[PDB]
């Protein structure tokens, strides 16, 4: 087999165009090859079948919001405020690409077999949990944040993102009310990233 | 005709219930009836259509939580703290109830004609709109709260709460961990109401 670059990623992105513009988290093959522009064999090849190409396209999705929580145990200069300041921005500008990641997610879990589910799970409900738990903790023993439940602080982000990008896209395409510009969606990070930050910072 | 009390209540609450153990936002008219033990004339009697239904299980859904932010300004003891974190509180056990929400929301939106989409757009995406301002404005205005966006606010509730009930459905579902014990919901609503204050309270 000779190798085509761009392909893989061509159906990736093909894929969350179609359920992006639609606001619909499933697509069908047949889209995916007329809009792409890649024959029905192609999916085959790289993925396997929908199931696949809807996994790759989680993990493709998830790989900044997983590398931003690595990030948050990085021996840099930056204190503990700045660098969840940053992890809850990379949160959002996902969000704002992928705002459907939250249903996928959940539709894989529900509808894989009981071991990838549970991988997948693992995986993806709070990424890096381990790094997640020891960033947050370090953080309430230094006295900057209060006692909180990492896990719930990961979905108040990841909810909060997903309800706001969701409903402007709908709205978007059901008034042509194109609001989401980049004084919009700059004025929507810096708001959130403070209601959130005022949720964790102690006194 | 002859009017049967409990029967449109039922087949709201069929449709609710097929949503909620299936973690889904779709049901057929076959299901329904089936689950229900009534028949595909009934639907059609109380709804006109699916779409008709859904429209009737939206409504009845958000009715809590339109009353929620109705007693935002009621004249009883209450301070602006009180009364907001029994809002929140609301729309917790309203996700509890009805995780799929949103989702309904969305879609619905989504496949209306645009004059039905904007009524239930303008009605649902901040519920009595013009009280959750002046509550919020007020609060502002005596120092209590912080300056924020309601909406933002309300997406940042709802967003949470959903998130978390509807993973915490999937994975009972999928890996039978039953955890949605009246000891952790407690635990949930209250972590979450302390958060989102913390997020809004002035100093
Ligand atoms: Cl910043
Ligand atoms: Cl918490
Ligand atoms: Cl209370
Ligand atoms: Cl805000």
Same mark, same amino acid.
């Given at each position: 087999?000779?190798?085509?670059?761009?392909?893989?990623?061509?159906?990736?992105?093909?894929?969350?165009?179609?359920?992006?513009?639609?606001?619909?988290?499933?697509?069908?093959? $047949?889209?995916?090859?007329?809009?792409?522009?890649?024959?029905? &064999?192609?999916?085959? =090849?790289?993925?396997?079948?929908?199931?696949?190409?809807?996994?790759?396209?989680?993990?493709?999705?998830?790989?900044? %919001?997983?590398?931003?929580?690595? #990030?948050?145990?990085?021996?840099?200069?930056? $204190?503990?405020?700045?660098?969840?300041?940053? @992890? +809850?921005?990379?949160?959002?500008?996902?969000? =704002?690409?992928?705002? =459907?990641?939250?249903?996928?997610?959940?539709?894989?879990?529900?509808?894989?077999?009981?071991?990838?589910?549970?991988? %997948?799970?693992?995986? =993806?409900?709070?990424?890096?949990?381990?790094?997640?738990?020891?960033?947050?903790?370090?953080?309430?023993?230094?006295?900057?944040?209060?006692? %909180?439940?990492?896990?719930?602080?990961?979905?108040?982000?990841?909810? &909060?993102?997903?309800?706001?990008? $969701? &409903?402007?896209?709908?709205?978007? @395409?059901?008034?042509?009310?194109?609001?989401?510009?980049?004084?919009?969606?700059? $004025?929507?990070?810096? @708001?959130?990233?403070?209601? %959130?930050? &005022?949720? +964790?910072? #102690?006194?």
């Amino acid at each position: 087999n000779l190798e085509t670059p761009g392909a893989r990623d061509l159906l990736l992105q093909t894929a969350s165009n179609i359920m992006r513009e639609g606001d619909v988290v499933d697509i069908s093959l $047949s889209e995916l090859s007329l809009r792409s522009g890649l024959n029905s &064999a192609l999916v085959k =090849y790289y993925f396997g079948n929908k199931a696949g190409l809807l996994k790759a396209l989680l993990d493709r999705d998830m790989e900044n %919001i997983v590398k931003s929580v690595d #990030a948050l145990l990085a021996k840099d200069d930056m $204190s503990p405020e700045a660098k969840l300041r940053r @992890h +809850i921005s990379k949160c959002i500008d996902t969000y =704002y690409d992928y705002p =459907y990641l939250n249903r996928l997610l959940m539709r894989l879990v529900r509808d894989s077999d009981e071991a990838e589910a549970k991988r %997948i799970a693992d995986q =993806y409900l709070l990424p890096l949990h381990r790094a997640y738990n020891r960033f947050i903790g370090e953080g309430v023993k230094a006295g900057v944040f209060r006692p %909180i439940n990492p896990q719930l602080f990961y979905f108040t982000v990841t909810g &909060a993102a997903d309800r706001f990008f $969701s &409903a402007r896209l709908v709205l978007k @395409h059901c008034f042509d009310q194109d609001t989401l510009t980049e004084q919009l969606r700059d $004025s929507y990070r810096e @708001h959130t990233v403070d209601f %959130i930050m &005022a949720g +964790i910072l #102690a006194h």
